[PDB]
Every structure is written in C-alpha cells, then in structure tokens.
Chain A
Amino acid sequence: GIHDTNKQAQAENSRQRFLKLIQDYRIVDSNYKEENKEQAKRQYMIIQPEATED
C-alpha cells in the first residue's frame, strides 16, 4: 500500500485491530496468571493430609 493512500489506510486499520487483539490476548493471559496464584495460595496455606511414605 506504499503508493496508494487508501491501501495504506486499510493496512493501518488492520494494524490497529490486530494490536487490539494482541492487547485482549495479553489481558486474558495476565488475569489468568493472577487467578492461578490465588488458587495456589489457597490450597497449601493450611494444615495438610497426614505425612507421606519415604
């Protein structure tokens, strides 16, 4: 699209939308990482099942 303004506009719109998608992906990933930490803290912050074998 280097030589046609309309083609360049189309390319830029695609770039914008793809960037937004990337942002959505990042947000989902971060939220999930933050949630996986809390469950991990939940499970072992307490007295535990009776001791293992050896």
Chain B
Amino acid sequence: GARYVRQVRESDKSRLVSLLIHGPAGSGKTALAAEIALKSGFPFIRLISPNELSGMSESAKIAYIDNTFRDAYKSPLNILVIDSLETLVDWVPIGPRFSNNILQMLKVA
C-alpha cells in the first residue's frame, strides 16, 4: 500500500489509480483500508459507506454520490474509500434483484 501511495504522489502521468481489496467475510478488510488512508498523509480524505445512506430515496443516493465525487476535484491530492460495494447496489441472490442505476453511476465514476 505504501508503495502505491508513493507512486501516485510522485508520478506526473498516472493521474488515477484504483485498487480492489477482496477476501472472505470477517477477514478484517476495512481496517486495512483505513489504516493505509490515515498513514498516507494526504490533505484530502473521504469515505463513502452504506451507513450514511439509510432511509433515503434512490434519487437522493445518486445525488449524494455525485456530490461526493464532484467535491474531490479541488485540492490536487485526494483519497476516497468506498465500502462494501455489493451492499451499496442492493444485491440479493434469490432473484437476483438489485438497482441498476446506482451500479451504472459507480461504473462511470
């Protein structure tokens, strides 16, 4: 993680790097993500987590997410953490059923 952080810090051509952190349930992933983010020491750090979104309507969600990407385009060094993608998009295997719009917004973002 530290290597990647330095790489983004220094490079002039690589202007965007994205990572996946995957593993079994209960392995303790978000802790690692947060620790990397803190120790990185950038000016600008934000978090998107399901917890903030409970009770809102769909349009509200897409608005919020759009906002949270837009506000990060100041401050020339930035870090965002997205937590638990599958639950953000409303996955349940029986149908399967889920919300396609949110999925697209994230895909394009």
Binding site for B on A (CB under 8 A): 44, 47-48
Name the B residues within 8 Å of A44 (CB-CB). Answer: 94
The CA-CA distance from A47 to B94 in the complex, in Å, is 8
- Chain B, interface size category, equals under 10
The CA-CA distance from A24 to B96 in the complex, in Å, is 41
The CA-CA distance from A48 to B95 in the complex, in Å, is 7
4 contacts between A and B (CB under 8 A): A44-B94, A47-B96, A48-B95, A48-B96
The CA-CA distance from A44 to B94 in the complex, in Å, is 8
The CA-CA distance from A44 to B93 in the complex, in Å, is 11
Interface residues of B in 51-109 (CB under 8 A from A): 94-96
